[PDB]
Curated annotation (Swiss-Prot), chains A, B:
Role according to the record: Fatty acid synthetase catalyzes the formation of long-chain fatty acids from acetyl-CoA, malonyl-CoA and NADPH. The alpha subunit contains domains for: acyl carrier protein, 3-oxoacyl-[acyl-carrier-protein] reductase, and 3-oxoacyl-[acyl-carrier-protein] synthase.
Domain of life according to the entry: Eukaryota
Residues of the full protein shown: 333 to 348 of 1885
Protein name: Fatty acid synthase subunit alpha
Species of the source: Candida albicans (Yeast)
Subunit structure: [Alpha(6)beta(6)] hexamers of two multifunctional subunits (alpha and beta).
Protein family per UniProt: Belongs to the thiolase-like superfamily. Fungal fatty acid synthetase subunit alpha family.
Segment forming the signal sequence: none
Length: 16, 16
C-alpha cells in the first residue's frame, strides 16, 4: 500500500 | 535549484 504509493512517487520523480 | 530539490526528494524515497 504505502510502499506502492512510494514506488509511484519515485517513478514520477524519475520521469520528470 | 528545483532539480536539486527533486534529486534529493527521490534519494529519500529510495532510502525508505
Amino acid at each position: 500500500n504505502k510502499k506502492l504509493a512510494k514506488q509511484q512517487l519515485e517513478v514520477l520523480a524519475r520521469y520528470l
